[PDB]
């Protein structure tokens, strides 16, 4: 009598949190929306998807999350978001499945008890929140996997800026489960503080 499960691309507000669900493989992945800042995902022989809860306008907020993260294959557990002007997507990657994400290495930041490698990558004529675009992606990837704890997001944005990785005006910001050509499940809860 109350959680909702979705299977079609959409964004909105559920139980007081913004959420986004997107896939290029409809029918292979779903998202179940729980109370507060929590949700689950389940996926089976999927294509690409990203799903999560958080805020429709991101910023430097310190956040705390807890997750069950059970990928069989390539997947990430990430504080993920976008800016515009310039258009950039960013990923603060707390855990991953078979593959650890990398890109052009730009240093490290030590925050919330862990050390993260910083990377930049580019996407050329690729999908984005503004349609097909060429744009940058910024990454902080933890040196060891974690599935709960605090992310002082402003420390990542400051570290990126010291490496020349400049953000624009914030669009959404979510604690996401990202998957590629894998199966698995997650349950993720996020809140500020």
mmCIF file of C-alpha atoms in Angstrom:
data_model
loop_
_atom_site.group_PDB
_atom_site.id
_atom_site.type_symbol
_atom_site.label_atom_id
_atom_site.label_comp_id
_atom_site.label_asym_id
_atom_site.label_seq_id
_atom_site.Cartn_x
_atom_site.Cartn_y
_atom_site.Cartn_z
ATOM 1 C CA UNK A 1 0.000 0.000 0.000
ATOM 2 C CA UNK A 2 2.590 2.636 -0.949
ATOM 3 C CA UNK A 3 5.979 2.382 -2.437
ATOM 4 C CA UNK A 4 5.866 2.841 -6.212
ATOM 5 C CA UNK A 5 7.816 0.887 -8.815
ATOM 6 C CA UNK A 6 8.614 2.558 -12.186
ATOM 7 C CA UNK A 7 10.013 1.267 -15.465
ATOM 8 C CA UNK A 8 9.816 4.252 -17.838
ATOM 9 C CA UNK A 9 12.209 7.194 -18.101
ATOM 10 C CA UNK A 10 11.039 10.064 -15.922
ATOM 11 C CA UNK A 11 12.010 12.505 -13.154
ATOM 12 C CA UNK A 12 9.900 13.903 -10.377
ATOM 13 C CA UNK A 13 9.541 14.209 -6.619
ATOM 14 C CA UNK A 14 8.746 11.232 -4.447
ATOM 15 C CA UNK A 15 8.347 11.356 -0.641
ATOM 16 C CA UNK A 16 9.947 14.826 -0.581
ATOM 17 C CA UNK A 17 13.019 13.947 -2.718
ATOM 18 C CA UNK A 18 13.774 14.569 -6.352
ATOM 19 C CA UNK A 19 14.400 11.366 -8.349
ATOM 20 C CA UNK A 20 15.559 10.525 -11.840
ATOM 21 C CA UNK A 21 15.312 7.212 -13.727
ATOM 22 C CA UNK A 22 16.780 6.798 -17.193
ATOM 23 C CA UNK A 23 17.607 3.804 -19.386
ATOM 24 C CA UNK A 24 18.188 2.954 -23.021
ATOM 25 C CA UNK A 25 16.953 -0.589 -22.340
ATOM 26 C CA UNK A 26 13.321 -0.313 -21.245
ATOM 27 C CA UNK A 27 11.942 -3.503 -19.649
ATOM 28 C CA UNK A 28 15.347 -4.592 -18.268
ATOM 29 C CA UNK A 29 15.546 -2.333 -15.197
ATOM 30 C CA UNK A 30 13.173 -0.894 -12.648
ATOM 31 C CA UNK A 31 13.302 1.471 -9.735
ATOM 32 C CA UNK A 32 11.218 1.190 -6.567
ATOM 33 C CA UNK A 33 10.717 4.447 -4.637
ATOM 34 C CA UNK A 34 10.793 4.106 -0.826
ATOM 35 C CA UNK A 35 10.194 6.614 1.984
ATOM 36 C CA UNK A 36 12.343 9.675 2.250
ATOM 37 C CA UNK A 37 15.600 9.649 0.279
ATOM 38 C CA UNK A 38 15.538 5.885 -0.356
ATOM 39 C CA UNK A 39 14.999 3.712 -3.419
ATOM 40 C CA UNK A 40 15.916 0.300 -4.836
ATOM 41 C CA UNK A 41 16.835 -0.833 -8.310
ATOM 42 C CA UNK A 42 16.778 -4.213 -9.985
ATOM 43 C CA UNK A 43 18.168 -4.935 -13.430
ATOM 44 C CA UNK A 44 18.615 -8.047 -15.617
ATOM 45 C CA UNK A 45 20.720 -8.155 -18.781
ATOM 46 C CA UNK A 46 20.358 -4.435 -19.158
ATOM 47 C CA UNK A 47 21.861 -1.776 -21.493
ATOM 48 C CA UNK A 48 22.736 1.534 -19.802
ATOM 49 C CA UNK A 49 20.824 3.020 -16.866
ATOM 50 C CA UNK A 50 21.197 5.629 -14.111
ATOM 51 C CA UNK A 51 18.682 5.965 -11.293
ATOM 52 C CA UNK A 52 18.737 7.785 -7.993
ATOM 53 C CA UNK A 53 17.245 10.181 -5.492
ATOM 54 C CA UNK A 54 18.544 13.536 -4.343
ATOM 55 C CA UNK A 55 17.838 17.199 -5.251
ATOM 56 C CA UNK A 56 16.667 18.959 -8.392
ATOM 57 C CA UNK A 57 19.290 21.653 -7.729
ATOM 58 C CA UNK A 58 22.680 20.356 -6.576
ATOM 59 C CA UNK A 59 25.274 22.212 -4.546
ATOM 60 C CA UNK A 60 28.034 21.830 -2.012
ATOM 61 C CA UNK A 61 25.849 20.133 0.641
ATOM 62 C CA UNK A 62 27.403 17.541 2.889
ATOM 63 C CA UNK A 63 25.388 14.339 2.519
ATOM 64 C CA UNK A 64 25.260 10.914 4.178
ATOM 65 C CA UNK A 65 24.169 7.704 2.468
ATOM 66 C CA UNK A 66 23.777 4.005 3.143
ATOM 67 C CA UNK A 67 23.517 1.390 0.455
ATOM 68 C CA UNK A 68 23.157 -2.275 -0.324
ATOM 69 C CA UNK A 69 25.032 -2.515 -3.622
ATOM 70 C CA UNK A 70 24.898 -5.899 -5.383
ATOM 71 C CA UNK A 71 26.000 -5.678 -9.023
ATOM 72 C CA UNK A 72 26.843 -8.815 -11.065
ATOM 73 C CA UNK A 73 28.945 -6.916 -13.590
ATOM 74 C CA UNK A 74 29.716 -3.312 -14.446
ATOM 75 C CA UNK A 75 27.926 -0.833 -12.186
ATOM 76 C CA UNK A 76 28.703 2.146 -9.882
ATOM 77 C CA UNK A 77 27.382 3.680 -6.693
ATOM 78 C CA UNK A 78 27.889 7.398 -7.236
ATOM 79 C CA UNK A 79 26.960 10.910 -6.099
ATOM 80 C CA UNK A 80 26.078 11.986 -9.634
ATOM 81 C CA UNK A 81 24.930 15.260 -11.107
ATOM 82 C CA UNK A 82 24.956 17.861 -13.831
ATOM 83 C CA UNK A 83 25.698 21.488 -14.382
ATOM 84 C CA UNK A 84 24.914 23.782 -17.334
ATOM 85 C CA UNK A 85 26.849 26.775 -18.779
ATOM 86 C CA UNK A 86 29.140 24.870 -19.017
ATOM 87 C CA UNK A 87 27.410 21.515 -19.373
ATOM 88 C CA UNK A 88 29.293 18.960 -17.245
ATOM 89 C CA UNK A 89 28.293 15.658 -15.578
ATOM 90 C CA UNK A 90 30.143 14.609 -12.486
ATOM 91 C CA UNK A 91 30.527 11.418 -10.480
ATOM 92 C CA UNK A 92 31.787 10.942 -6.934
ATOM 93 C CA UNK A 93 32.185 7.176 -7.117
ATOM 94 C CA UNK A 94 31.981 5.324 -3.769
ATOM 95 C CA UNK A 95 31.835 1.757 -5.078
ATOM 96 C CA UNK A 96 31.844 -0.129 -8.358
ATOM 97 C CA UNK A 97 31.391 -3.663 -9.780
ATOM 98 C CA UNK A 98 33.712 -5.423 -12.201
ATOM 99 C CA UNK A 99 35.334 -2.196 -13.463
ATOM 100 C CA UNK A 100 36.788 0.759 -11.603
ATOM 101 C CA UNK A 101 36.148 3.970 -13.556
ATOM 102 C CA UNK A 102 39.208 6.026 -14.722
ATOM 103 C CA UNK A 103 40.045 8.830 -17.088
ATOM 104 C CA UNK A 104 42.751 11.441 -17.363
ATOM 105 C CA UNK A 105 44.326 11.513 -13.851
ATOM 106 C CA UNK A 106 44.419 14.915 -12.214
ATOM 107 C CA UNK A 107 45.452 14.301 -8.610
ATOM 108 C CA UNK A 108 43.735 13.201 -5.438
ATOM 109 C CA UNK A 109 41.510 14.650 -2.760
ATOM 110 C CA UNK A 110 41.387 13.277 0.821
ATOM 111 C CA UNK A 111 38.010 13.783 2.413
ATOM 112 C CA UNK A 112 35.532 11.948 4.697
ATOM 113 C CA UNK A 113 38.182 9.461 5.760
ATOM 114 C CA UNK A 114 39.133 8.335 2.303
ATOM 115 C CA UNK A 115 41.382 9.317 -0.576
ATOM 116 C CA UNK A 116 39.862 9.715 -4.058
ATOM 117 C CA UNK A 117 41.563 9.797 -7.464
ATOM 118 C CA UNK A 118 40.416 12.689 -9.634
ATOM 119 C CA UNK A 119 39.807 12.177 -13.361
ATOM 120 C CA UNK A 120 38.440 14.095 -16.281
ATOM 121 C CA UNK A 121 36.941 12.545 -19.371
ATOM 122 C CA UNK A 122 35.173 13.918 -22.414
ATOM 123 C CA UNK A 123 32.098 12.766 -24.299
ATOM 124 C CA UNK A 124 31.815 13.748 -27.929
ATOM 125 C CA UNK A 125 28.428 14.190 -29.693
ATOM 126 C CA UNK A 126 26.875 12.191 -26.872
ATOM 127 C CA UNK A 127 23.553 12.105 -24.952
ATOM 128 C CA UNK A 128 23.107 14.667 -22.128
ATOM 129 C CA UNK A 129 20.470 16.646 -20.235
ATOM 130 C CA UNK A 130 20.642 19.178 -23.060
ATOM 131 C CA UNK A 131 20.422 16.684 -25.994
ATOM 132 C CA UNK A 132 23.421 15.585 -28.127
ATOM 133 C CA UNK A 133 26.469 17.522 -26.987
ATOM 134 C CA UNK A 134 30.250 17.313 -26.531
ATOM 135 C CA UNK A 135 31.053 17.965 -22.876
ATOM 136 C CA UNK A 136 33.250 17.050 -19.939
ATOM 137 C CA UNK A 137 32.724 14.582 -17.113
ATOM 138 C CA UNK A 138 34.496 15.000 -13.774
ATOM 139 C CA UNK A 139 35.263 12.088 -11.439
ATOM 140 C CA UNK A 140 36.339 11.455 -7.879
ATOM 141 C CA UNK A 141 36.813 7.713 -7.444
ATOM 142 C CA UNK A 142 37.461 6.341 -3.939
ATOM 143 C CA UNK A 143 40.692 4.316 -3.611
ATOM 144 C CA UNK A 144 38.708 1.684 -1.698
ATOM 145 C CA UNK A 145 35.055 0.761 -2.118
ATOM 146 C CA UNK A 146 32.625 1.962 0.554
ATOM 147 C CA UNK A 147 28.788 1.561 0.688
ATOM 148 C CA UNK A 148 27.988 4.011 3.507
ATOM 149 C CA UNK A 149 29.327 7.231 4.914
ATOM 150 C CA UNK A 150 29.450 11.002 4.498
ATOM 151 C CA UNK A 151 30.384 12.855 1.312
ATOM 152 C CA UNK A 152 31.458 16.455 1.860
ATOM 153 C CA UNK A 153 30.629 17.387 -1.742
ATOM 154 C CA UNK A 154 32.178 20.853 -1.601
ATOM 155 C CA UNK A 155 35.614 19.277 -0.931
ATOM 156 C CA UNK A 156 35.341 17.386 -4.255
ATOM 157 C CA UNK A 157 34.222 20.480 -6.152
ATOM 158 C CA UNK A 158 37.149 22.473 -4.656
ATOM 159 C CA UNK A 159 39.640 19.765 -5.558
ATOM 160 C CA UNK A 160 38.285 19.640 -9.114
ATOM 161 C CA UNK A 161 38.580 23.381 -9.495
ATOM 162 C CA UNK A 162 42.257 23.298 -8.347
ATOM 163 C CA UNK A 163 42.858 20.848 -11.279
ATOM 164 C CA UNK A 164 41.172 23.235 -13.793
ATOM 165 C CA UNK A 165 37.881 21.241 -13.769
ATOM 166 C CA UNK A 166 35.295 24.000 -13.554
ATOM 167 C CA UNK A 167 31.579 23.471 -12.921
ATOM 168 C CA UNK A 168 28.658 25.518 -14.226
ATOM 169 C CA UNK A 169 25.205 26.271 -12.681
ATOM 170 C CA UNK A 170 23.822 23.206 -10.919
ATOM 171 C CA UNK A 171 21.092 21.071 -12.281
ATOM 172 C CA UNK A 172 20.125 17.852 -10.443
ATOM 173 C CA UNK A 173 22.279 15.902 -7.962
ATOM 174 C CA UNK A 174 21.418 12.316 -6.883
ATOM 175 C CA UNK A 175 22.927 9.344 -5.087
ATOM 176 C CA UNK A 176 22.750 7.060 -8.089
ATOM 177 C CA UNK A 177 23.046 3.468 -9.095
ATOM 178 C CA UNK A 178 24.606 3.355 -12.598
ATOM 179 C CA UNK A 179 24.686 0.141 -14.644
ATOM 180 C CA UNK A 180 26.016 -1.039 -17.972
ATOM 181 C CA UNK A 181 25.309 -4.438 -19.604
ATOM 182 C CA UNK A 182 25.131 -6.133 -16.300
ATOM 183 C CA UNK A 183 22.368 -7.563 -13.862
ATOM 184 C CA UNK A 184 22.023 -6.872 -10.148
ATOM 185 C CA UNK A 185 20.214 -4.801 -7.544
ATOM 186 C CA UNK A 186 20.726 -1.949 -5.094
ATOM 187 C CA UNK A 187 18.982 -0.209 -2.258
ATOM 188 C CA UNK A 188 20.269 3.298 -1.533
ATOM 189 C CA UNK A 189 19.274 5.915 1.064
ATOM 190 C CA UNK A 190 20.596 9.493 0.984
ATOM 191 C CA UNK A 191 20.005 12.592 3.127
ATOM 192 C CA UNK A 192 21.743 15.897 3.835
ATOM 193 C CA UNK A 193 24.079 16.236 6.861
#
